[PDB]
Design a protein around this nucleic acid. Structure first.
Ligand SMILES: [Mg+2]
Lengths: 224, 185, 138, 136, 386
RNA sequence: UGUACAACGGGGUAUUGUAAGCAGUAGAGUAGCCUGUUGUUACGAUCUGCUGAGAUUAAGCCUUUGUUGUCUGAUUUGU
RNA sequence: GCAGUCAAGCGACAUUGCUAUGUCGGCUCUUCCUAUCAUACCGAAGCAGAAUUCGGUAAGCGUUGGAUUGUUCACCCACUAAUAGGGAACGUGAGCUGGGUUUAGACCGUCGUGAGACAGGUUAGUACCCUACUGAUGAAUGUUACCGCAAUAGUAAUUGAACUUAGUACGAGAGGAACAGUUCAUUCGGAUAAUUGGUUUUUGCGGCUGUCUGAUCA
RNA sequence: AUAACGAGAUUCCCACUGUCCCUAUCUA
RNA sequence: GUGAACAGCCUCUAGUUGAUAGAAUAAUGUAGAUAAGGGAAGUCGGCAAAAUAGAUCCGUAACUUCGGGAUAAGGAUUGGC
């Protein structure tokens, strides 16, 4: 577990996306945010200065795993070309023409299982399943429609927003086949998915994250 | 909040100085808080607006000496009135020391009259207000407002009931005492 | 940069031109100029307007389907930007444009064929039915 | 710019002046918002404060759950419905002007946002983007 | 009486009086510092406005939220054909300000400048330089004496140059004389460089260059007698006010008993010389190079000139300078380009402007095609073709 | 008295929207002759092909390898 | 203020208990003063940081949108760096508004025998002259034309935010900054149609109704 | 000695709109 | 002729071409209009403008002197062959 910050935003997940084989960060501001990942990731996996539709919220406009990456229609051809160049052939890049461009919020997924907004058409669901090679299910966390913003998942474990009920927690844990814990991040923030980015060996959250929150994140994700 | 001002508070002291005795003419609906055709020393009349000061003056003279209306804004100034050349009558404009259920604020100028429908509903039992219109055994008072609007044909363009206007009319009728209510002693 | 096809006419919409409309359905509609935007705002159907490419495609005034048009597609899967591939695509685009122009000209000629016979018949009808005019002429 | 903004604000056309009614776009139960003032606007003679996409305004709920009426809380405009200059080079406008209610810290009252959300508002407000299922 | 309210005065008081300019050519007031450590070079150039166009530029401005993004913006196009030196002026400092010592003309002058000295040129005998030309030759001395006098006493050297109007699409046929101060090497070097350029032509790329910042000085658009409402932005009266509503109602107080000069009366609007600074040059063009409007991100062999030509202007056909923003003056108007006049070091000046795509669609209407080839490909063959 | 100027005309660029007329085994349907059961000949708003056709194009758009016409009308100015 | 208190000078400073009878107001406009609300620069304050109080020069700029008073009385919401106080016949009727005040009609209360009056409340009401200013021609300078200097007059930019500094100095904790560098925006000012919005007498192109040219076209 | 009706006096709601934000264009 | 109408417009019989005019379309005015988003936030005050306007069908509340409200309100249609 490592503490970092955007220019001044503690919602790391909004401006960055982290996976087991690649990471994405916003280009705005300075390289202080970029260097934070280097301290922990170094050059083991690529780190790409990429924008999506000209926004700095690439962490929420895109979703993917070590096997593939997805971008919305608003992404310009230049951004797609840069992403293709800056990532290995083992990481697929597929443009998505879905109605809901918020892939990062609509889709919450790990290397094995994925959750999507039920409004997503079956065609895009099949595309996500094929590109990412993961099981895709239509589910919500205790009525939270945006699974990608209220949930965080990884091969080691996952974390959901505190309002999740015990029955919902059990159902989601059974479906995703990984341990889950209901808690807050960034000093009581309920948007766990957007607050922090986590992978199988590295969790990055905002400075506001309290020590109990960091300990819970480490324990659930088995980072130490 | 209205019914008070420096120009209004000034009249009360003026009439008190110009009057030798004050008699209670407060509203009989809430004792815990007089018609023309049926019913020198200066006596001053003190009370809230829409209490009966003008009506009580008129009934004493058996004519419409003073303007009478349900609106609290009867008049900002007083005038001298005499009967039998024995006692002088003076009525101060209604002053409310530092609301809508009482005859204080005009319902016309209130931007949000809907929220007061539960207030009037609380005062009166179900049957008492039902007898006023007798349209349904209403629940979800917003639905009651819509039902009354449809019954009275108070609907805006398209067909939607005029909730605001219907609520304003309900409050205005409540000011007239159409729906009976009283405070238990 | 990206040239967008007009929703109402399919004409190329260069950056900084026209107006784009976004509906509650979460999709975007781009109009090259104010004319198309106003026409759309009236709920008109482009298939019923003669001056838009939709009617010509439906009416068959121009080649609707051709092998050359298959090259142009929305490449949802990017390419690794090989230098040789760039030059090959640069030459291929010009060749495909030339071939498409030739095919369009051939289609137009095939559509317009036979007008000469109709014109000749009309001229014959006019000449036969106007003997007095010719007599006065000579 | 008020608290919660993570960058400079683009110069865009003024869509909603004081008193403009904008539809709600969150599950907080409110349906319409009445703008009384615009935060960060420099008042000048005869000039009615006006907001735009991504701006934070103070509004009182006029329709919806009565519990939210008669109280003024900060609101963020998600749709402008007036053509504004996008740096990408397109004069885009939204079908209907709408906004969302949030605290000064930028936390969204509603758990999720419904309908399209302007790019210039989602980008400037991380919470709006996180709670928005659609961008542009 | 404090009037209970404070409001900024309508219109800047420095730009007064708002009278018509005495000449269509906006004379330059001040030249750069003229540091004599650099090589001799010109300080300004003459060009003709040729409309505007749009540009998409891959902004590389660090720190900005548009960093590495694509931003579309407006750019003005000015026709700047080569300029020919036709004389030199030697200025000697005096206690009453700079004074002109003497003027030396070239051996021969084109009819363009000879025409500038006549108003009935077609009736004129064209005696422009009948004796001066005779005085130049047969001794090589009379001019040399003037050159030596200039070298001895001059402090700042100004070169007389004029635009090649005949090369422009304008039907004016008359050139515009102007004085351009010589910077760089010592005044002797200045005059020596100018002397060697007599009857020769000077290009534009040698003065300005890409990413360079220049100041635009030209006469603004004329509008004639204008009401105060538009002249100074005065607010309109509510409605149907007696004796008019589109005019300032109160002009002044009883004391003083006179109308104050600053009460913004109605009068002539426009046609006033104005100076604008910090204009970045986006592209420098040449008339002999095809694909002037092309870019590394476009590959199209097309000229900057829009389809069907410019509005109220012909085809460039010559060297041109592309500048962002808006420049004072209307199309086909003489505008003088001047250096920044100060050692600008802002990041905007240091920025490199690499154009991504240049708009050449017709400005005659809602243009949808960049070149006639695109229009032919889209519309296809027509009835008139066969 | 010549890359001289003006009126037209040809192109480029734009605006609008498919012109008159012709023919139709399209055309809800209604009528003479006949003798069906796609009868034929008549009316028939519209539609189809010539036909992205037709019209305007500077009065403050660009160009002109063409046609026609024009190029000594009065006054004033001196160290 | 009342009634005392002592005393350098010829009674200073300090010291003892309590304590509306008027009509002016508002929209635009220009200018001026500082007794400085905000912005620049500084000193003293328990200034550890942050925030804040007072004091010194400084008027360039900025000093608002709204519930609401006819109003003289004058109170609240919100933004903003702040929403400081005044003058120019408490400027501004041949500028507007007559809003309020004030004719001729009329309604209600008091008095008056009466006509009428009010302590009173309501209603409806009739520059084309000179100069200054803003723009613009002009004879005389041997003639015309071009390029120039500048005596002089005016003058403008303004304010807040965002990254880095840096969660760093400071700080037990809470929290929390400088400077320099970089990026936008608020108000104001000068330009201009590149793109988009707006105008249609281009009566430019199409359609629609009444009517007329015998029908079509026009 | 209170229904209808009103160029009677005042308050409020829907539509609306250049009164305004902020002014711009055209025709005689 | 259109139209319920001698409402509004064109035409036939009949009667007129009489209002000083030539050039331009500067500001400001007189008369008539259009306008992106808000929809009274302007003003002493919805002052002016605007909005519905004819015909066919559904439907039409409180009050009431039962005669009225009423064309209440609010909704669906309007061309051609
Ligand atoms: Mg009373």
């Amino acid at each position: 577990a490592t503490r970092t910050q955007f220019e001044n935003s503690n919602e790391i997940g909004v401006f960055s996306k982290l996976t087991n084989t690649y990471c994405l960060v916003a280009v705005g501001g300075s390289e202080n945010f970029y260097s934070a990942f280097e301290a922990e990731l170094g050059d083991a996996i690529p780190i790409v200065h990429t924008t999506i539709a000209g926004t700095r919220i690439i962490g929420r406009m895109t979703a993917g795993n070590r096997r593939g990456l997805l971008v919305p229609t608003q992404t310009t051809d230049q951004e797609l070309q840069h992403l293709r160049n800056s990532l290995p052939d083992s990481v697929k890049i597929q443009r998505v023409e879905e109605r809901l461009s918020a892939l990062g919020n609509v889709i919450c997924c790990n290397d094995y299982v994925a959750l999507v907004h039920p409004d997503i058409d079956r065609e895009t669901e099949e595309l996500i399943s094929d590109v990412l090679g993961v099981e895709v299910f239509r589910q919500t966390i205790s009525g939270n429609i945006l699974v990608g913003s209220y949930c965080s998942l990884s091969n080691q474990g996952g974390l959901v927003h505190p309002q999740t009920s015990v029955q919902d927690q059990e159902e989601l844990s059974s479906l995703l086949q990984v341990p889950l814990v209901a808690g807050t991040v960034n000093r009581g923030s309920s948007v766990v998915g957007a607050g922090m980015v986590v992978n199988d060996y590295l969790a990055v959250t905002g400075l506001d994250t309290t020590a109990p929150e960091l300990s819970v994140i480490e324990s659930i994700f088995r980072l130490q | 909040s209205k019914g008070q001002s420096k120009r209004i508070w000034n009249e009360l002291y003026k009439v008190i100085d110009s009057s030798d005795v004050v008699i209670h003419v407060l509203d009989a609906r809430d004792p815990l808080g007089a018609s023309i055709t049926n019913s020198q020393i200066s006596v001053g009349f003190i009370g809230y607006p829409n209490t009966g000061k003008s009506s009580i003056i008129n009934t004493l003279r058996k004519k419409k000496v003073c303007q009478v209306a349900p609106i609290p804004g009867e008049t900002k100034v007083w005038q001298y009135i005499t009967l039998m050349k024995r006692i002088f009558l003076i009525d101060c404009p209604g002053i409310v020391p530092p609301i809508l259920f009482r005859g204080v604020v005009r319902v016309e100028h209130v931007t949000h009259p809907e929220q007061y429908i539960p207030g009037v509903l609380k005062r009166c039992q179900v049957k008492h207000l039902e007898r006023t219109y007798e349209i349904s055994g209403w629940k979800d008072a917003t639905e009651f407002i819509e039902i009354l609007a449809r019954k009275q044909g108070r609907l805006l363009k398209g067909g939607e009931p005029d909730e605001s206007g219907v609520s304003k009319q309900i409050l205005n009728d409540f000011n007239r005492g159409k729906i009976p209510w009283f405070v238990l002693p | 940069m990206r040239i967008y096809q007009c929703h109402f006419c399919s004409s190329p919409c260069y950056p900084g031109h026209g107006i784009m409309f976004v509906r509650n359905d979460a999709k975007e509609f781009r109009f090259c100029r104010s004319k198309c935007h106003k026409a759309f705002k009236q709920r008109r159907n482009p298939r019923k307007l003669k001056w838009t490419k939709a009617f010509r495609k439906a009416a068959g005034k121009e080649l609707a389907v051709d092998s050359t048009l298959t090259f142009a597609q929305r490449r949802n899967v990017p390419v690794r930007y090989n230098r040789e591939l760039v030059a090959t695509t640069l030459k291929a685009m010009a060749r495909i444009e030339e071939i498409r122009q030739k095919r369009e000209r051939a289609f137009y000629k095939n559509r317009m064929r036979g007008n000469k016979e109709k014109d000749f018949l009309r001229d014959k009808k006019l000449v036969e039915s106007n003997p007095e005019l010719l007599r006065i002429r000579e | 710019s008020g608290n919660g903004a993570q960058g400079t604000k683009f110069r865009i056309s003024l869509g909603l002046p004081v008193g403009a009614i904008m539809n709600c776009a969150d599950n907080s139960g409110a349906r319409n918002l009445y703008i009384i003032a615009v935060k960060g606007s420099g008042s000048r003679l005869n000039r009615l404060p006006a907001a735009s996409l991504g701006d934070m305004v103070m509004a009182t709920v006029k329709k919806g759950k009565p519990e939210l009426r008669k109280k003024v809380m900060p609101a963020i405009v998600v749709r402008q419905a007036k053509s504004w200059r996008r740096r990408d080079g397109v004069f885009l406008y939204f079908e209907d002007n709408a906004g969302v209610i949030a605290n000064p810290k930028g936390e969204m009252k509603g758990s999720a946002i419904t309908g399209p959300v302007g790019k210039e508002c989602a980008d400037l407000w991380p919470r709006v983007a996180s709670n928005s299922g659609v961008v542009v | 009486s404090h009037r209970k309210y404070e409001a900024p005065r309508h219109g800047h008081l420095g730009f007064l009086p708002r009278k018509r300019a005495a000449s269509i050519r906006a004379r330059v007031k001040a030249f750069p510092k003229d540091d004599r450590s650099k090589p001799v070079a010109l300080t300004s150039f003459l060009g003709y406005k040729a409309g505007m166009t749009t540009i998409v530029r891959d902004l590389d401005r660090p720190g900005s939220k548009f960093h590495k993004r694509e931003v579309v913006e407006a750019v003005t196009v000015v026709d700047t054909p080569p300029v020919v030196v036709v004389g030199v002026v030697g200025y000697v400092e005096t206690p009453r300000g700079l004074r002109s010592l003497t003027t030396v003309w070239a051996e021969h002058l084109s009819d363009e400048v000879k025409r500038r000295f006549y108003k009935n040129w077609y009736k004129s005998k064209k005696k422009a330089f009948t004796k001066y030309s005779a005085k130049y030759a047969q001794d090589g001395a009379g001019i040399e004496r003037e050159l030596a006098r200039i070298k001895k006493y001059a402090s700042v050297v100004r070169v007389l140059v004029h635009t090649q109007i005949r090369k422009t699409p304008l039907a004016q046929k008359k050139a515009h004389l102007a004085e351009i101060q010589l910077n760089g090497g010592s005044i002797s070097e200045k005059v020596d460089w100018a002397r060697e350029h007599f009857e020769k032509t000077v290009a534009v790329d040698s003065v300005f260059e890409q990413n360079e910042m220049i100041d635009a000085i030209a006469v603004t658009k004329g509008h004639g007698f204008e009401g105060v409402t538009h002249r100074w932005g005065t607010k309109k009266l509510p409605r149907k006010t007696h004796r008019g509503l589109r005019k300032v109602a109160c002009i002044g107080a009883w004391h003083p008993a006179h109308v104050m000069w600053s009460v913004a009366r109605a009068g002539q609007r426009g046609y006033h010389s104005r100076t604008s600074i910090n204009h970045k040059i986006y592209r420098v063009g040449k008339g002999d190079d095809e694909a002037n409007g092309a870019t590394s991100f476009d590959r199209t062999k097309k000229t900057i000139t829009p389809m069907g030509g410019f509005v109220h202007y012909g085809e460039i056909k010559n060297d041109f300078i592309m500048v962002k923003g808006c420049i004072p003056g209307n199309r086909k108007r003489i505008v003088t380009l001047r250096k920044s006049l100060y050692t600008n070091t802002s990041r905007k000046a240091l920025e490199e402007v690499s154009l991504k795509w240049i708009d050449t669609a017709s400005k005659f209407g809602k243009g949808r095609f960049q070149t006639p080839a695109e229009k032919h490909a889209f519309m296809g063959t027509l009835k008139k073709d066969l």
